């Protein structure tokens, strides 16, 4: 029951000579209290794996006997702060220590025990009523945007005995107490949940609502669904914040949880200002989004096991706030960093290198954390519902799409937004490829689109066909010289160009072009494709009938109409009314119809 530490082959040490206890328990070693995991047992012996450094630990130093596995504390106040893999409140640690370097073994809870909070119970249940796991039992007003509901943990039930009156209380004050068959249990504002399992839900409901993204590009093209899974490659100079910011501001999600690995303080500070700058006027005011969101990240110096546990801490936080009855979006950034973390862990266990150092169970772990997703029906009295989405950014080593990890992720995910650096070099933002990106969720979205628009699907299919045909014809027009071809083909190229310069592009530094409503995008695309349809029919008829109209004639006669099509993007729905924009677009369509009729 005492220290019998060893030396190390790396940054990890072992011990033995302790009582029997279940493995995968985190026990602390020494007076500096270094955290390590029970792994292997041989009789009274039990090896350990500390994550911090091993220097300075003698034989015989005390072994603090815990009773739990790797776990994360859950409760109010998580939002607004920053946490590492072990869930340590780094900002509060800096405040308490008034020091720069991380002290070893900081024995402070993720949440303090010195801040009061306003509590309101269900105000309908009484003493003696029956309760079961998942049933809400309170509500906390963390801030003016989100209210954090409170329920009983799973695997709990029985007859209530004590309901606290409302008031100002901290987390150390027991708020609920009940009597089960033969025993009685007490519950405070905080609950602890094992990391290595899945929280239970009544069932899963198929995802059928499109995730809202501010940019019309990568939303009208290759839509995402709330509760889905997707992959976006990311590298230096191509931009990852261009999507992180977009999902942090221009989206229907209720919460963002950004999990990082191997990051710098630039993203932390820039995002902590981006929250009070790029803000949502839901109630007509500017407010920090940090109060809504939660940030977790580690750097390269941190312990490898902490780097590996960071993603699990993130996703369990996501599921806790998804049980709340909300929409959660998890940015699981740098799957490559996660993969090297796994390789580093496996390096010390002497596991067979299957494929470039990867353990055999890499694909299993991949599938198992992507498994924890989707829209679900939560456990509770009032039939709570909500969704959690994951966005796993891929990071190929030099753009080689042959990693085991990248290939497996491609196999699991359903949507893919290929990102390029060539377009950013070409001065085109946002950077999408339009050919290697794909979406597989269209079949589910057919119901919603048929219920609301009844034109998006034909129009999108037409746009995709036109773009692919133009890419096919780019080579023939290169061998002809781009100065002679059939009029129908020419007009096809012209509309493909049009779609390129006024539909498939958006400026983030223009105040009014940082958010395109989906209906606005649909109206734009319908207008453009109707214009093309009428032009194509006119040319095809006049080719055989009389006075074959050439695109020169069309463009010169209708140059004002091309000007209006180019200027359609300058509408600014923020200041300009929806009905006004619809009336303007319909009037433009009527003008185009009359102009075409006067032509023929």
């Amino acid at each position: 029951t005492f220290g019998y530490v060893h030396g190390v082959s790396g940054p990890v040490v072992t011990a033995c000579d302790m009582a029997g206890a279940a493995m995968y328990e985190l026990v602390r070693v020494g007076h500096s209290e270094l955290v390590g995991e029970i792994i292997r047992l041989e009789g009274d012996m039990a090896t350990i794996q500390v994550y911090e450094e091993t220097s300075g630990v003698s034989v015989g130093d005390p072994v603090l006997r815990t009773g739990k596995p790797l776990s994360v504390e859950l409760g109010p106040g998580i939002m607004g702060a920053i946490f590492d893999g072990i869930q340590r409140p780094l900002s509060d640690i800096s405040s308490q220590t008034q020091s720069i370097y991380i002290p070893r073994g900081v024995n402070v809870s993720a949440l303090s025990r010195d801040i009061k909070w306003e509590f309101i119970p269900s105000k309908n249940l009484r003493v003696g009523s029956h309760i079961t796991g998942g049933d809400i039992y309170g509500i906390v007003n963390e801030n003016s945007l989100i209210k954090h509901k409170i329920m009983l943990p799973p695997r709990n039930r029985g007859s209530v005995t004590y309901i606290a009156p409302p008031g100002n209380y901290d987390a150390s004050d027991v708020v609920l107490e009940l009597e089960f068959e033969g025993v009685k249990e007490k519950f405070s504002m905080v609950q602890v949940w094992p990391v290595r399992q899945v929280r239970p839900v009544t069932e899963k409901l198929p995802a059928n609502h499109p995730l809202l993204t501010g940019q019309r590009v990568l939303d009208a093209l290759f839509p995402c669904v709330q509760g889905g899974t997707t992959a976006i490659p990311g590298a230096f100079g191509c931009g990852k914040t261009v999507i992180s910011q977009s999902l942090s501001k221009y989206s229907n999600s209720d919460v963002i949880i950004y999990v990082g690995c191997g990051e710098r303080g630039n993203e932390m500070s820039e995002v902590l200002r981006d929250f009070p700058e790029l803000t949502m006027e839901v109630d007509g005011k500017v407010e920090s989004i940090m109060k809504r969101t939660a940030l977790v990240a580690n750097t390269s110096n941190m312990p490898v096991a902490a780097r590996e546990a960071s993603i699990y801490t993130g996703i369990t936080l996501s599921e806790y706030f998804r049980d709340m009855g909300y929409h959660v979006s998890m940015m699981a950034d740098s799957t490559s960093r996660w993969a090297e973390a796994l390789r580093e862990i496996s390096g010390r266990l002497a596991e067979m290198p299957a494929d470039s150092g990867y353990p055999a169970y890499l694909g299993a772990r991949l599938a198992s954390f992507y498994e924890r997703a989707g829209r679900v029906k939560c456990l509770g009295n009032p039939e709570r519902e909500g969704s959690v989405s994951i966005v796993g950014a891929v990071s190929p080593p030099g753009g080689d799409f042959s990693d085991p990890v990248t290939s497996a992720t491609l196999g699991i995910v359903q949507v893919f937004w290929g990102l390029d650096k060539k377009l950013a070099q070409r001065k085109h933002f946002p950077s999408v490829n339009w050919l290697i990106s794909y979406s597989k969720y269209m079949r589910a979205l057919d119901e919603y689109y048929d219920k609301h628009f009844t034109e998006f699907v034909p129009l999108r299919t037409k746009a995709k066909e036109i773009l692919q045909e133009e890419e096919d014809l780019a080579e023939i027009v290169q061998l002809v010289g781009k100065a002679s071809l059939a009029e129908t083909d020419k007009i096809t190229l012209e509309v493909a160009k049009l779609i390129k310069d006024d539909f498939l592009q958006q400026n983030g530094y223009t105040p009014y072009d940082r958010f395109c409503p989906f209906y606005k995008t649909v109206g734009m695309l319908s207008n453009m494709i109707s214009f093309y349809d009428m032009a194509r029919r006119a040319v095809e008829t006049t080719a055989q009938s009389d006075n074959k109209i050439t695109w020169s004639i069309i463009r010169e006669h209708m140059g004002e109409i091309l000007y209006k099509l180019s200027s359609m993007k300058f509408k600014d729905p923020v200041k300009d009314g929806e009905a006004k924009i619809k009336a303007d677009y319909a009037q433009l369509l009527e003008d185009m119809q009359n102009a075409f009729r006067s032509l023929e």
């Binding site: 940054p11 220097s55 630990v57 370097y101 230096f236 303080g265 110096n301 390096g347 080593p397």
Partner: protein, 468 residues
């Protein structure tokens, strides 16, 4: 703190290469330092490696040679290795273990610090803002080096990377003359150099060059010759970096760390891992190597509330010009940006042979701007890069197409290529150019074309220098 007497042992239960195994040790401690007295009175340091029960193992720094199984004394310090750090050590030269070699005294310690250091709280990090001029036009003009931008330099054996580093050292400085030359006198800039795996000739050359330049009032030097024990090659970086962290976050200075020859560092780590009886990983290197390089490199940057900073410039070689080799792969993962050299440029007697085509820089976008410098850097650099690229393509075109088919603009591209090569890239062993001087040279180069071909520079900034 420590008040107990020091213990000695005469027990030697065996040896196996660099290891010495003994028992009847009372309460040993990992990473505990040990002194060994041989039969002939010779002293040899060492570090504890493996502990179990009563048995303990010690790795001897000076190698196991002539260690008798009886006539051997083994003295346990009772602590871990602590650096006696002090600010006044500037201008001194130490060996790997820290013992003086410059005929100076033992470092009269100001404070003892842990050699393994401590990681930095990520909340307390300040983003780099402004740049450091290293005196090398071929780097500065087209590629800034912000304060705390970990930019390595990739080279191969036989190229003058060591000489390039020496020029960087003996010409480095700041650009605080921007506000006032009189205000530039408030200098707080230092350089710490760590020569590792360096042979006699190059080590002595570094010593001589640094000694002749006369700037050693702001240069603290560490030297580890090849003949020294392999295990000291892995402790020298810790010593240098501990000194740097002290001098920055306790004396509020701006420190440029240079480590050389990380390939020998990796070889030494391979040696220790093999000595530890651990199965090798990918390409015969230890698995945990990523963690190791991370804990080396990540200790450099800025901290809130202090006027001080680090900039770290590691140098490494590429085995067989293999960029996919693990050493550059892990380095490129950890660090930001990359600088290369190219063998053909050195073969053409062009010094320094710095290729700007594959040069890359992340923090340049904010390392340069108005106020702290001029309004004419990003445009100038982008114009130079694009013009050089098209010039290379046009030279390729001329190679076969023929001189009779050339146009005036194509002749202009050839002229730009040759002038850029002979003037901007080529600097010389001691020609120290300032940032503004290199900009002026770049403008003199750009003057060949009219304003039309210089599209990358807006007309408002063209009006500044174009009509000259």
């Amino acid at each position: 703190y420590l008040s107990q007497p020091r213990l000695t042992y005469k027990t030697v239960s065996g040896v196996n290469g660099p290891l010495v195994i003994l028992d009847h040790v009372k309460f040993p401690r990992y990473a505990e330092i040990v002194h060994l007295t041989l039969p002939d009175g010779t002293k040899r340091s060492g570090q504890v490696l493996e502990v179990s029960g009563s048995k303990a193992v010690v790795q001897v720094f000076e190698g196991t040679s002539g260690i008798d199984a009886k006539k051997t004394s083994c003295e346990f310090t009772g602590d871990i290795l602590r650096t006696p750090v002090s600010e006044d050590m500037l201008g001194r030269v130490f060996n790997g273990s820290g013992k003086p070699i410059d005929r100076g005294p033992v470092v009269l310690a100001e404070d003892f610090l842990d050699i393994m250091g401590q990681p930095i709280n990520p909340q307390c990090r300040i983003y780099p803002e402004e740049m450091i001029q290293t005196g090398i036009s071929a780097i500065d003009g087209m590629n800034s080096i912000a304060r705390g931008q970990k930019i390595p330099i990739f080279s191969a054996a036989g190229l003058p990377h060591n000489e390039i580093a020496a020029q960087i050292c003996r010409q480095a400085g700041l650009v605080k003359k921007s506000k006032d030359v009189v205000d530039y006198s408030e200098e707080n800039f230092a350089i710490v150099f760590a020569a590792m795996g360096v042979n006699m000739e190059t080590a002595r050359f570094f010593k001589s060059d640094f000694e002749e330049n006369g700037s050693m009032d702001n240069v603290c030097l560490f030297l580890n010759l090849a003949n020294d024990p392999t295990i000291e090659r892995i402790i020298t970086p810790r010593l240098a970096l501990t000194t740097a962290e002290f001098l920055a976050y306790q004396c509020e200075k701006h420190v440029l760390v240079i480590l050389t020859d990380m390939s020998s560092y990796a070889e030494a780590l391979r040696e220790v891992s093999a000595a530890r009886e651990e199965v090798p990983g990918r390409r015969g290197f230890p698995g945990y190597m990523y963690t190791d390089l991370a804990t080396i490199y990540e200790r450099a940057g800025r901290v809130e509330g202090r006027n001080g900073s680090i900039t770290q410039i590691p140098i490494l070689t590429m085995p067989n010009d293999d960029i996919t080799h693990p050493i550059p792969d892990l380095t490129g993962y950890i660090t930001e940006g990359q600088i290369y050299v190219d063998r053909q440029l050195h073969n053409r007697q062009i010094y320094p042979p710095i290729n700007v085509l594959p040069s890359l820089s992340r923090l340049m976008k904010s390392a340069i701007g108005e106020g702290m410098t001029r309004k004419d850097h990003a445009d100038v650099s982008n114009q130079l890069y694009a013009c050089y690229a098209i010039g290379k393509d046009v030279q390729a075109m001329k190679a076969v197409v023929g001189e009779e088919a050339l146009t005036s603009d194509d002749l202009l591209y050839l002229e730009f290529l040759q002038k850029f090569e002979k003037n901007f890239i080529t600097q010389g062993p001691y020609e120290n150019r300032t940032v503004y001087e290199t900009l002026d040279i770049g403008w003199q180069l750009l003057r060949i074309f009219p304003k039309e071909m210089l599209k990358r520079i807006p007309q408002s900034t063209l009006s500044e220098f174009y009509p000259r």
